[PDB]
Amino acid sequence: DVKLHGSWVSPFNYRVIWALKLKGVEFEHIVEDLTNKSELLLKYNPVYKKIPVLVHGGKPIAESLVILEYIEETWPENPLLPTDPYERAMARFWIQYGATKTAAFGALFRASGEELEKAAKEVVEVLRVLEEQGLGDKKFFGGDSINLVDISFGLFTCWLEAIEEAAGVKVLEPSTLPRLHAWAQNFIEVPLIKENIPDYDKLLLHMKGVREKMM
């Protein structure tokens, strides 16, 4: 009834898996080959022709951020957004902030030397804003448990850790971002996340490969 088209290393696909598993929704994972895309993926998502795509009752929903809100509205139990409109707007604001800065991270895989060290400092600054103004002193962006904001920022855990190791740069460190680093450790320790993350060695292998073609 619920099908998920996506990659086994994509952080965007994992956001959807986390949300469905937090809701207790049974789903079939359909592995999408990037070199040979199926007839379903080209008709379900004709605009971007990219993953992830959620299919519910044969109807497709693309773009992980739209998918996350569809899951929240379709399965309202175990809420992943607050009910207060101002708090919901702040959650949307931080999610959009992360989505806009998912471009400054690309410079970590293209630049080198003193140009790479400039890109790393820019990413640290983006993370510091998120830490100070978004997370604050809460355990999670969702307060005492993870919400859509934590899910949207989960890529700053093992995916960012793999990029840091592939490019030889340090960005999310305890000395510079103590609260965000403590959050990243707590996020990965949440049993739902721990049981549903890609193998680090396989993910690191992929990030090294991506860095290679991006120079």
Added chain:
Amino acid sequence: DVKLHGSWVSPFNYRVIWALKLKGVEFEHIVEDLTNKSELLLKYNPVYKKIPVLVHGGKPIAESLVILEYIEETWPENPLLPTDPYERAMARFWIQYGATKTAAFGALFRASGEELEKAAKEVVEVLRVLEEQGLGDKKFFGGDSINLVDISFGLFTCWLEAIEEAAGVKVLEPSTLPRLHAWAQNFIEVPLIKENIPDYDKLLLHMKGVREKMM
């Protein structure tokens, strides 16, 4: 009680005015000087330091797309989004699609000659997808009346018309995009929009000026 910080020519500020006026919400418009920004705008929006910013009960909400959903949730009467989760996801999807392509339009103010004619054809293609897959045969993106999707695409009416006249290119034409062009005319004819759009001559003067510095 409700204050709006924004520009008198910005399409993003007009989206917010339309939504507040469709809800019957009394608000004070605070004109924001770009050369000399007030102490309020720098504290209310410390992340982008940009307009528009809605302030409700002294609390700021930035980013027109987050603001539009806050207005919809705070004043739920006269709905501007459908109740069905799939239809709401499709509205969010098209809004995000327009927000992502609000970069291909920038090439209309930077390129010239055969490079400008390439940018115009790219924008026509973006609009054709919106027309075929988003609008279809409906009078408005919201069906029989305007919704958040129409509001988010209102910049394709007189703002796009001013860019077309400033750059000497044709993008949204009746021969090539008949349904989207008919929509653009119907949108501008809606009394709420007609009574709340910038003066065309002043807007054209601004677009010519923006084209100048962007080359």
